Amino acid sequence: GSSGSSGKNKRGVLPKHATNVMRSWLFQHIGHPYPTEDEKKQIAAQTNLTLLQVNNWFINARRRILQSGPSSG
Numbered sequence: 337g338s339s340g341s342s343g344k345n346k347r348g349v350l351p352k353h354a355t356n357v358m359r360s361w362l363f364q365h366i367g368h369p370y371p372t373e374d375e376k377k378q379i380a381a382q383t384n385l386t387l388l389q390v391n392n393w394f395i396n397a398r399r400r401i402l403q404s405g406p407s408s409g
Contacts, residue, residue: 340388350393354383358393362401369398 357379362369371379376390383390 357382
């Protein structure tokens with residue numbers, strides 16, 4: 337029974353190595369930032385993160401780029 341969602345580290349930070357992989361991917365699919373069941377599996381390894389992490393990071397990331405675009409600041 338995989339678990340992780342429960343509880344959210346009030347403060348968390350990932351290494352540049354992890355942000356690198358995810359970043360590259362996000363940019364490659366900037367239009368549609370949606371990781372595939374596989375991407376989450378493969379990436380998790382390259383970044384050494386858990387399916388949960390890779391997801392959380394993306395969810396938060398996509399949000400940043402999502403808002404920062406259509407809105408004329």
